[PDB]
């Protein structure tokens, strides 16, 4: 709670490289993550990532708790890292009261509200619905940061529709004077949208984030972008996996698939479905590394021979192949 993320890191390094009795625990990692997350001086985002990588010790009783997931979600939200934030929020959902812990009494900008706003702005509304369901399950009311934009239509409910930053047509005309007296008329208390020279965001939604609010992207744009990314990684797998594929028709189907993929990224659908993208499958990568699928010290130029040479010299082994998915045991992914 000092505000300097380097005084706690010294104690963390004293614990980590000390004896066994003074080795760190889950509470220590949580405290250092809280210290680095709530800094006010510099970026401190790669520090949290390196600390999380150091936190990967499965058979050392170092397992995450509710506070770990809450702090990781808060950190990745404040720095617009939405994917890992959702990854850790999926784990936080399993604990009871985890959303209440994420809403740390609203003292630090309502990190749950910041998470909801980050989900709303980019357009990942299915994860927003999941978060709302989790909040309803944990009996957590919506934080009061349901901020309206310059157009009072904006809310977490419908700011992701195709018409963005534009108000829909209604039977009655928009009464801007009524709104004026509603926000506060001549009571000298209104948000005047005028740019200022100082380094202060005029938009009130940017408050709470280290740099800025996540960029505004609609749900349809996010869907088409993820579709293009899926097809692009499929084409990448086809490229770096050779012509050999489950499909037996090589000549015409290769050209058809490559041209259709080039068109998509910028009825033979079974051929594209045959290509499987193996991402995050540690077993497949371990089986591939195991090979199942002058006059100085030099390693053999072949890849599998280099692998067996490393395994003989103990440089790297299949036991060292692990990630958080496996370590923290998140099965759902």
């Amino acid at each position: 709670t000092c505000g300097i993320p380097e005084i706690a890191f010294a104690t963390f390094e004293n614990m980590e490289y000390g004896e066994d009795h003074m080795k760190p625990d889950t509470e220590t990692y949580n405290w250092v993550i809280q210290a680095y997350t709530r800094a006010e001086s510099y970026d401190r985002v790669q520090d949290v990532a390196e600390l999380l990588g150091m936190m990967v010790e499965d058979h050392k009783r170092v397992q995450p708790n509710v506070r770990t997931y809450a702090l990781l979600v808060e950190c990745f939200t404040k720095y617009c890292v939405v994917r890992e934030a959702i990854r850790h929020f999926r784990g936080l959902k399993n604990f009871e009261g985890g959303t209440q812990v994420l809403y740390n009494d609203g003292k630090y900008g309502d990190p749950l509200s910041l998470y909801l706003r980050a989900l709303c702005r980019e357009g990942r509304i299915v994860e927003l619905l999941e978060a709302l369901e989790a909040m309803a399950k944990d009996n957590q009311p919506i934080p009061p940061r349901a901020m309206i934009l310059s157009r009072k239509y904006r809310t977490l409910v419908s700011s992701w529709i195709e018409p963005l930053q534009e108000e829909a047509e209604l039977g009655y005309e928009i009464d801007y004077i009524a709104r004026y007296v509603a926000e506060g008329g001549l009571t000298g208390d209104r948000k005047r949208w005028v740019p200022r020279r100082g380094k202060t965001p005029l938009d009130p939604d940017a408050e709470g984030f280290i740099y800025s609010n996540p960029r505004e992207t609609s749900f349809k744009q996010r869907c088409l972008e993820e579709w293009r990314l899926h097809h692009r990684k499929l084409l990448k797998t086809l490229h770096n996996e050779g012509p050999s594929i489950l499909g037996k028709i090589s000549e015409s189907d290769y050209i058809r698939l490559v041209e259709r993929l080039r068109k998509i990224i910028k009825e033979l659908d079974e051929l594209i479905s045959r290509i499987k993208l193996h991402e995050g499958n540690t077993e497949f990568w371990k089986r591939r590394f195991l090979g199942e699928g002058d006059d100085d010290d030099w390693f053999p130029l072949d890849i599998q021979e280099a692998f067996v040479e490393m395994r003989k010299r103990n440089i790297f082994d299949v036991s060292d192949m692990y990630t958080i998915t496996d370590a923290w045991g998140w099965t759902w992914e």
Binding site: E16, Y17, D295, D296, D297, R313, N314
Partner: protein, 49 residues
């Protein structure tokens, strides 16, 4: 003189500040890998933990 100066700068910071860091990995020294010089193997092994 020039070579002695630059080297010091790059590695100036390093200082022994811990008794053990906890690493479980170590390099494998084998004679037949590098034509097996006996004197070089002895010089390599001597002084290490």
């Amino acid at each position: 003189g020039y070579l002695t100066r630059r080297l010091v700068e790059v590695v100036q910071h390093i200082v022994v500040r811990r008794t053990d860091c906890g690493t479980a990995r170590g390099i494998s020294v084998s004679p037949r890998n590098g034509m097996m010089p006996e004197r070089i193997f002895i010089q390599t092994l001597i002084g290490r933990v």
